[PDB]
Symmetry: T
Subunit: 63 residues, 12 copies
Amino acid sequence: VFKKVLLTGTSEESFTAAADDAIDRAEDTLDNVVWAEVVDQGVAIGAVEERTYQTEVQVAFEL
Amino acid sequence: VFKKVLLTGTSEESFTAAADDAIDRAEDTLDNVVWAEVVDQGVAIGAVEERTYQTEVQVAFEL
Amino acid sequence: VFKKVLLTGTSEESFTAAADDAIDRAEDTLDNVVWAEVVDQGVAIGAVEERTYQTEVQVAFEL
Amino acid sequence: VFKKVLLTGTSEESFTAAADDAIDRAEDTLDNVVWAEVVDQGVAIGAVEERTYQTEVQVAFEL
Amino acid sequence: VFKKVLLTGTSEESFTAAADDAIDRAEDTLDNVVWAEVVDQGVAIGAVEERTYQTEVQVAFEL
Amino acid sequence: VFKKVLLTGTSEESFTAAADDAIDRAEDTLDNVVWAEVVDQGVAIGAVEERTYQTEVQVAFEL
Amino acid sequence: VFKKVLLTGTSEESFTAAADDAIDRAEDTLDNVVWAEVVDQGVAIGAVEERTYQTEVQVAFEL
Amino acid sequence: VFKKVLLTGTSEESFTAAADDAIDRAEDTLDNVVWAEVVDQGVAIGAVEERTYQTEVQVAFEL
Amino acid sequence: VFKKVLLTGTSEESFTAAADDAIDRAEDTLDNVVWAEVVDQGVAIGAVEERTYQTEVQVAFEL
Amino acid sequence: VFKKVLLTGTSEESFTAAADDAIDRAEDTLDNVVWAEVVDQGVAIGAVEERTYQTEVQVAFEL
Amino acid sequence: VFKKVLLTGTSEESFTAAADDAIDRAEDTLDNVVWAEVVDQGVAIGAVEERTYQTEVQVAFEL
Amino acid sequence: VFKKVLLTGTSEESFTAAADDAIDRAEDTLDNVVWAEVVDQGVAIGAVEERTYQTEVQVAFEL
Ligand SMILES: Cc1cc2nc3c(=O)[nH]c(=O)nc-3n(C[C@H](O)[C@H](O)[C@H](O)CO)c2cc1C
Ligand SMILES: Cc1cc2nc3c(=O)[nH]c(=O)nc-3n(C[C@H](O)[C@H](O)[C@H](O)CO)c2cc1C
Ligand SMILES: Cc1cc2nc3c(=O)[nH]c(=O)nc-3n(C[C@H](O)[C@H](O)[C@H](O)CO)c2cc1C
Ligand SMILES: Cc1cc2nc3c(=O)[nH]c(=O)nc-3n(C[C@H](O)[C@H](O)[C@H](O)CO)c2cc1C
Ligand SMILES: Cc1cc2nc3c(=O)[nH]c(=O)nc-3n(C[C@H](O)[C@H](O)[C@H](O)CO)c2cc1C
Ligand SMILES: Cc1cc2nc3c(=O)[nH]c(=O)nc-3n(C[C@H](O)[C@H](O)[C@H](O)CO)c2cc1C
Ligand SMILES: Cc1cc2nc3c(=O)[nH]c(=O)nc-3n(C[C@H](O)[C@H](O)[C@H](O)CO)c2cc1C
Ligand SMILES: Cc1cc2nc3c(=O)[nH]c(=O)nc-3n(C[C@H](O)[C@H](O)[C@H](O)CO)c2cc1C
Ligand SMILES: Cc1cc2nc3c(=O)[nH]c(=O)nc-3n(C[C@H](O)[C@H](O)[C@H](O)CO)c2cc1C
Ligand SMILES: Cc1cc2nc3c(=O)[nH]c(=O)nc-3n(C[C@H](O)[C@H](O)[C@H](O)CO)c2cc1C
Ligand SMILES: Cc1cc2nc3c(=O)[nH]c(=O)nc-3n(C[C@H](O)[C@H](O)[C@H](O)CO)c2cc1C
Ligand SMILES: Cc1cc2nc3c(=O)[nH]c(=O)nc-3n(C[C@H](O)[C@H](O)[C@H](O)CO)c2cc1C
Ligand SMILES: [Cl-]
Ligand SMILES: [Cl-]
Ligand SMILES: [Cl-]
Ligand SMILES: [Cl-]
Ligand SMILES: [Cl-]
Ligand SMILES: [Cl-]
Ligand SMILES: [Cl-]
Ligand SMILES: [Cl-]
Ligand SMILES: [Cl-]
Ligand SMILES: [Cl-]
Ligand SMILES: [Cl-]
Ligand SMILES: [Cl-]
Ligand code: NA
Ligand code: NA
Ligand code: NA
Ligand code: NA
Ligand code: NA
Ligand code: NA
Ligand code: NA
Ligand code: NA
Ligand code: NA
Ligand code: NA
Ligand code: NA
Ligand code: NA
Ligand code: NA
Ligand code: NA
Ligand code: NA
Ligand code: NA
Ligand code: NA
Ligand code: NA
Ligand code: NA
Ligand code: NA
Ligand code: NA
Ligand code: NA
Ligand code: NA
Ligand code: NA
Ligand code: NA
Ligand code: NA
Ligand code: NA
Ligand code: NA
Ligand code: NA
Ligand code: NA
Ligand code: NA
Ligand code: NA
Ligand code: NA
Ligand code: NA
Ligand code: NA
Ligand code: NA
Ligand code: NA
Ligand code: NA
Ligand code: NA
Ligand code: NA
């Protein structure tokens, strides 16, 4: 059985690096992370000193 | 990194109050709740004594 | 077996009350109404004297 | 010909009142506003002193 | 309030049995499981000795 | 001209048998049933003694 | 309250004429037809002597 | 950079002519119109003396 | 078994004629073409001397 | 690099068996078939002597 | 109230840089730009000397 | 007439480079490649020694 957690990673560099930020956090806290699906992307501008790319992923892990 | 939980709030009064019901529960159990996105709305009729509005939200919190 | 009818309720007060308007009409004419799913919301402005909220629902009833 | 503008209204009271907030602004600045379609709803929590309902609408006006 | 977990069940027999695999796991670990919604189906071929049906479900439980 | 009715079939055995349950009911009551499209699938757990598969179909018939 | 019926019109000439075919049938059988929304278009080739355009519409009428 | 405006053209003749009605208006008022994407189609019946086809397009122009 | 090819037809006359352009090409090169589903429509303006309607279809053929 | 072909399998028995029918055909004609994603399901009634389940899959293979 | 403009940025380097191209143009011409949502990505090949990445964003600004 | 092939490119570096991987393969094997549309993105983790970005594109070519 696989389970997914819905995480939004952030990066001041790129959408790819924002995806990695989410996956890194999943791997810190979960065993058997197997894949991620991108479900949304966006950019924070107003509330941040530097433009911040965000990539939201469903991160799948095996139970 | 943000994480989302998928909750359905309920209310005998309105869709807005059903959204609040979900968010209230998230805030009882989670720190750093930052926003909610509505993803579905509906109404329970058959199994309830009073019509019950439901609002399903992804509730985002900062990790 | 359940069957659904696709109804748009209207209200000069709220989206919740427009949903109720549709469900009320279903219950006038159908037995065993069990639930409703919201599928669209909108607001009439041009053709009405007062802004009118509309909520479209699939209303499910048991056959 | 109709044209639509994509506006997000806000309210500390309800999703219906947030829709009205957007439509009010359209009517301040545009002639011949005819209807609005709801396209998204959400709730601001983290950055606001009071929970704030948001309703995003395409507001249609006749050219 | 209901909460949903996003699980992918697997089966060498059918999509129905893969849905049951996910629901069985939810019931092992959660109280008050009330319903499941199918959100995706697929088939593993390359990495498995036998074709494996997968059914992804949001499994709802009452809090 | 074809017309569609939106029906949810149920079965304690499979999603295929739940689709058949809906189509059977359409054929009891309608002439010239020609095809069905699956639009949703789910599983009832909380309110039923046995897990019950549901398959919702648009059932098309020729007028 | 408005209600919609889901009809597929057909034409050997165009998608517009197929939409009209559905609406014509609705007007034969229903009072107060007010609008139609196109929800699908396609073309029959295999089972027909002449290519046949199809346009599926939700046809709304006032109750 | 391209920008899009969301316009609904109308025609008493066809969906193609309704698309042209929107594009014509864009070209009256904008330089460097490059393409249009159809995003919705419908038919006005209740409020018009003659059935009126509508085609909604995102009309893209180069800045 | 049916297979689909994803083709975009073009026409200086109409969306219906653009659909026919795609289907004609499929029939030139494939046996047993059975139906087509419209999946997108658009209009070329910038790169063409005359406005050009495009209709994208999945064209199904029996293997 | 993976490539997908869009196939509709058929079966007089079940949606699972219809998926297998498509995958079997892909494996007859392609090397390195790795997975399939279900994208649609339906049932043929009018043109067939026996109800026929159909399952449409994108079948992925490694190039 | 927030308003969104629908812009397609372009870049010969990456999808992230194409998003920035759109946002840069919004900031040249608008006050109070607060966020951007990615809604589409693509690549120009035929009409350009160098492959050109495009990222379409709704860019939100506060009124 | 344009035709599209549905390809998933892969890269150990970025989503942009994964899109290029797919397009490169299309250009190896097809004449008159004109554009690509991104339709999905994801990340392989479990089965690969290094995290691998994937970008799925419809690659359009002129017939
Ligand atoms: C992708 C994205 C989407 C956002 N959407 C919203 C929104 O719908 N409403 C809102 O008040 N703020 C939103 N914000 C936050 C907004 O830019 C700002 O920080 C304040 O919260 C409101 O000006 C969003 C930020 C990002 C990065
Ligand atoms: C929004 C909503 C959706 C529902 N959908 C279903 C359903 O698909 N199937 C079902 O058996 N009951 C459903 N129910 C519950 C149903 O109304 C009733 O309580 C029994 O579970 C079946 O009659 C739903 C209830 C709500 C509020
Ligand atoms: C949610 C909603 C959507 C509408 N969409 C349309 C439309 O697409 N075209 C149209 O002519 N009128 C539409 N109307 C009606 C319109 O506001 C007005 O009453 C006249 O029919 C046209 O100005 C709509 C009304 C509502 C409430
Ligand atoms: C509906 C809604 C959606 C939002 N989405 C985002 C988002 O995707 N990313 C983000 O950084 N902030 C988002 N925000 C703003 C967020 O709650 C907060 O104000 C800061 O901008 C980030 O903590 C959103 C706010 C609202 C009301
Ligand atoms: C439904 C489904 C979807 C899949 N999608 C992918 C994918 O997008 N990329 C991938 O590398 N492997 C995917 N795989 C796994 C793939 O078949 C194989 O096991 C290796 O991971 C890559 O050949 C998928 C497997 C299944 C069952
Ligand atoms: C597919 C499906 C969806 C359902 N969705 C809901 C829902 O959204 N809300 C609800 O109160 N009950 C829902 N129910 C019914 C629920 O499981 C239970 O019977 C009671 O109605 C609420 O616990 C659903 C049942 C099924 C089979
Ligand atoms: C828009 C459209 C969609 C169709 N889809 C299907 C389908 O999914 N399966 C099928 O057996 N026949 C389908 N047919 C009918 C098919 O072309 C033919 O008449 C036989 O029913 C099967 O070859 C479709 C026909 C049209 C016009
Ligand atoms: C495509 C289309 C969609 C429409 N949708 C609505 C609607 O949702 N609600 C409404 O009151 N009127 C709607 N109208 C207008 C409606 O037909 C009539 O003119 C009055 O506005 C209500 O009877 C629509 C008109 C068109 C052409
Ligand atoms: C339906 C349609 C969609 C198009 N989309 C794009 C696009 O996203 N980006 C682009 O550079 N050109 C696009 N073009 C082509 C564009 O109009 C023009 O020919 C040049 O390629 C760019 O100005 C499109 C053309 C059509 C007909
Ligand atoms: C899933 C499915 C979808 C279909 N859709 C259509 C359609 O849209 N139009 C049509 O004429 N026939 C359609 N058919 C075929 C139809 O049932 C019958 O065989 C004749 O082609 C028309 O009565 C479909 C068949 C199946 C199995
Ligand atoms: C993302 C994207 C989508 C496009 N879609 C189309 C289209 O649908 N039709 C078209 O003629 N050209 C399209 N073009 C432009 C096409 O590649 C070329 O420049 C000419 O306009 C037609 O060969 C598109 C370009 C891009 C970048
Ligand atoms: C985007 C993506 C989606 C995937 N989806 C699935 C899936 O649904 N099921 C599966 O068994 N493996 C999937 N895989 C492959 C999975 O990570 C692993 O390689 C094995 O195939 C199962 O652990 C996917 C891989 C990628 C890159
Ligand atoms: Cl989710
Ligand atoms: Cl409300
Ligand atoms: Cl419907
Ligand atoms: Cl706009
Ligand atoms: Cl979750
Ligand atoms: Cl099954
Ligand atoms: Cl109906
Ligand atoms: Cl036409
Ligand atoms: Cl495809
Ligand atoms: Cl828009
Ligand atoms: Cl293909
Ligand atoms: Cl990138
Ligand atoms: Na989730
Ligand atoms: Na930096
Ligand atoms: Na988002
Ligand atoms: Na921000
Ligand atoms: Na009350
Ligand atoms: Na729901
Ligand atoms: Na109920
Ligand atoms: Na219906
Ligand atoms: Na009032
Ligand atoms: Na609507
Ligand atoms: Na109106
Ligand atoms: Na208040
Ligand atoms: Na939003
Ligand atoms: Na906030
Ligand atoms: Na077995
Ligand atoms: Na999936
Ligand atoms: Na596999
Ligand atoms: Na049994
Ligand atoms: Na459902
Ligand atoms: Na239940
Ligand atoms: Na003719
Ligand atoms: Na269809
Ligand atoms: Na046919
Ligand atoms: Na005329
Ligand atoms: Na519309
Ligand atoms: Na009308
Ligand atoms: Na001409
Ligand atoms: Na397109
Ligand atoms: Na063009
Ligand atoms: Na394809
Ligand atoms: Na049999
Ligand atoms: Na289909
Ligand atoms: Na049939
Ligand atoms: Na817009
Ligand atoms: Na460069
Ligand atoms: Na696009
Ligand atoms: Na190009
Ligand atoms: Na590397
Ligand atoms: Na995918
Ligand atoms: Na993997």
